[PDB]
Design a protein around this ligand. Structure first.
Ligand SMILES: [Cl-]
Length: 513
RNA sequence: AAAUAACAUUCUU
């Protein structure tokens, strides 16, 4: 027959080319991969009317969109900094495109236009899980039971699809009935048991803290696992680290990665490490235990991982640090120096390391720690981004020992660094830092006097807003940081009746905008 | 059968 022959042929070449790229270890291949996705998705809306659009072709497309989500997340962490929320970014639009593309395919399956296999069903539901749509995963799965096409309905009931579903079902129902029945069948079964069924059942038992059943299934999973498809052992192993409430079992599995004890490769996934650090802090309140695990993670990473990974780790660590030393900047400052010395001994210091430290140090409300971090950027020869200059301006809102001159200086140096790094206009995060250093500080000191029972920063704030308005990303930022900001900080309302007639006296000196 | 993917520091509007 072949009415849609050319579109079917190009779809197979497209999907296979991009799937091979995303499974093998800007650039022409990078551009090909992302253009192959839009083209394949474009062909999908035409080929869904064809009868030769089998479950295999749909499943290969769903897998490809899944790898697109994986690649988009990877690209976000490889950047020198996260893009501003209010500006255009490849990460945001590509994520929405993949997500919307996955919605259209899920709806076409729930209606019956296209068929899907158990392999395609798992990538569809895993994708929606990675998009934080757990409840939608349960609806799609249970709606597959009452489908006309019994073949696709049977695919959603295959063991590997059930394996993905078990952790979501235990989160909702908290029922161990169906899991324990499956445990009795699987432990003594001589038949083929899909590794993803092992994985989901292990994860349930880890959350349920029935660790003996979790470790027993884990041993069977290991002896049966195939070298080419060993990733099931990675998910379960990491689950023991980040999900086990028994910290002694979690740390043993953590050491198995540090000491390279396992027969399979495994990444020290920072999300898993962060959850492990948080569980130690919530359960033990032992900062030394948190500090010892953080030290092992930093030495494990070294220079092998992206700076965005260590940034996420240091975020968790310094958040715990400044909660522990919330009322002790004296012993805290000595401990920070030990942390800086250790971190220097592992690798060259990255900027997010000091950015997180400076951000969280606002609880101390002292100027010495601000000048200490600012000095260390130059001392350790840190590649600078605009994040530091934003935080250095924001930090002035947590101390009283400063003047409108220093607020201007740290604002001017931020605008300079914006144009030095080729930034187009002034983003929301830039104005939010100036607002936090003026309006929030003034509202804070005002609320203290009411609760208790270079003289004005709000005037400088409104002067810079009006002076630098033509450099804004959008003129709607004027309403956002004036009338809209007054709804949250009412002390701005008493300065705003005469904003239209206000004059400005500042010192811009731009370059590239 | 077709595994595995770190959601980072600065951003209420
Ligand atoms: Cl930057």
């Amino acid at each position: 027959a072949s009415p849609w022959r050319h579109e079917l042929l190009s779809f197979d070449e497209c999907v296979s080319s991009a799937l091979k790229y995303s499974t093998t270890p800007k650039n022409p291949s990078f551009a090909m991969f992302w253009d192959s996705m839009g083209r394949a998705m474009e062909l999908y809306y035409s080929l869904r009317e064809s009868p030769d659009f089998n479950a295999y072709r749909v499943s290969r497309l769903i897998h490809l969109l899944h790898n697109g989500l994986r690649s988009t997340r990877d690209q976000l962490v490889k950047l020198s900094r996260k893009p501003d929320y209010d500006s255009q970014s490849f990460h945001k639009e590509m994520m929405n495109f993949l997500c919307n593309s996955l919605k259209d395919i899920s709806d076409d399956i729930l209606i019956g236009k296209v068929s899907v296999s158990g392999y395609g069903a798992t990538h569809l539901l895993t994708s929606f899980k990675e998009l934080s749509f757990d409840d939608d995963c349960i609806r799609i799965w249970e709606a597959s039971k009452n489908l006309s096409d019994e073949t696709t309905s049977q695919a959603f009931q295959e063991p590997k699809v059930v394996g993905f579903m078990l952790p979501l079902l235990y989160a909702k129902t908290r029922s161990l009935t169906e899991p324990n029945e499956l445990y009795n069948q699987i432990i003594q079964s001589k038949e083929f048991i899909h590794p993803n069924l092992y994985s989901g059942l292990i994860k349930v038992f880890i959350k349920a803290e029935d660790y003996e059943k979790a470790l027993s299934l884990f041993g069977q999973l290991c002896e049966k696992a195939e070298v080419r498809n060993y990733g099931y052992l990675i998910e379960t192993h990491l689950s023991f680290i980040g999900d086990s409430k028994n910290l002694t079992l979690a740390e043993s599995f953590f050491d198995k990665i540090i000491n390279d004890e396992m027969p399979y490769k495994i990444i020290l996934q920072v999300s898993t490490v962060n959850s492990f650090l948080q569980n130690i802090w919530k359960a033990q309140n032992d900062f030394d235990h948190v500090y010892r695990i953080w030290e092992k993670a930093v030495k494990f990473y070294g220079n092998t991982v992206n700076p965005g990974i260590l940034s996420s780790l240091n975020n968790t660590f310094f958040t715990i640090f400044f909660e522990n030393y919330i009322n002790d900047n004296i012993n805290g400052f000595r401990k920070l120096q030990e942390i800086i010395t250790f971190y220097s001994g592992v690798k060259k210091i990255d900027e997010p390391f000091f950015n997180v430290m400076l951000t969280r140090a606002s609880i101390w409300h002292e100027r010495s720690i601000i000048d200490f971090i600012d000095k260390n950027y130059t001392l350790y020869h840190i590649p600078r981004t605009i994040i530091s200059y934003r935080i250095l301006l924001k930090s002035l809102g947590s101390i009283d020992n400063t003047n409108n001159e220093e607020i201007l200086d740290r604002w001017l140096e931020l605008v300079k660094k914006l144009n030095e790094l080729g930034q187009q206009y002034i983003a929301n995060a830039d104005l939010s830092a100036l607002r936090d250093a003026t309006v929030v500080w003034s509202q804070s000191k005002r609320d203290e006097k009411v609760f208790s029972a270079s003289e004005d920063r709000i005037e400088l704030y409104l002067k810079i807003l009006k002076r630098y308005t033509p450099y804004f990303r959008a003129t709607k930022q004027v309403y956002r940081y004036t009338t809209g900001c007054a709804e949250s900080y009412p002390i701005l309302n008493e300065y705003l009746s005469g904003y239209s007639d206000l004059s400005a006296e500042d010192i811009p000196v731009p370059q590239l905008h």
